[PDB]
């Protein structure tokens, strides 16, 4: 257990949806934005090389890549879908990336009370035995070292 070390960093994933005042000519009823961001006062660009959002195949160019912040996709649509999201790290050792499956919903299952929706998903990422450089990238992004796993 001489050089065991575990680093935990937090990512915030989320989306906002609004019913349009007029549906588009294609019949899009909603404007949405999906994002990956750091917690308050945390720059995840230190450890994040790129984020890839995999949109539904109805959307044009469905593989959306943001190599720089802001890590977000903004589009208009008529239905919610499962959007795979890849967060690629600034490292040369595994884990190179983490893949999330995000539920972009235009309304919450139970009721449609208002025209505006906000959802937030905090995800804590755990790295065991990080290399020196990636640890410092992680620590600079607000990460902390915890009990070694």
């Amino acid at each position: 257990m001489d050089n065991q070390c575990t680093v935990q960093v937090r990512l915030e994933l989320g989306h906002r949806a609004q019913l349009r005042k007029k549906p588009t000519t294609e019949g899009f009823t909603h404007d949405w934005m999906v994002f990956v961001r750091g917690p308050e006062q945390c720059d995840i660009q230190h450890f994040v090389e790129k984020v890839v959002f995999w949109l539904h195949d109805s959307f044009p160019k469905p593989r959306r890549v943001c190599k720089e912040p802001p890590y977000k996709v903004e589009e208009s649509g008529y239905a919610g879908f499962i959007m795979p999201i890849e967060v690629h790290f600034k490292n040369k050792e595994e884990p190179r990336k983490v893949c999330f499956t995000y539920d972009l919903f235009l309304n919450l299952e139970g009721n449609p009370p208002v025209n505006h929706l906000r959802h937030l998903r905090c995800e804590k990422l755990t790295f065991n035995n990080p290399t020196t450089e990636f640890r410092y990238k992680l620590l600079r992004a607000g990460g902390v070292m915890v009990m070694p796993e």
């Binding site: 109805s58 239905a79 235009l106």
Partner: peptide, 4 residues
């Protein structure tokens, strides 16, 4: 709401 619709889903696809």
């Amino acid at each position: 709401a619709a889903r696809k």
